[PDB]
Amino acid sequence: KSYMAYLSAELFHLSGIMALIASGVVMRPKK
Secondary structure, X not given: OOOOOOHHHOOOOXXXXXXXXXXXXXXXXXX
């Protein structure tokens, strides 16, 4: 319960920031 069990319980706790977390942090890292 230490993975897909927890991260799946903290993706809406910030309805507003999490919905953009990815839509507001994309650039050109390319790693």
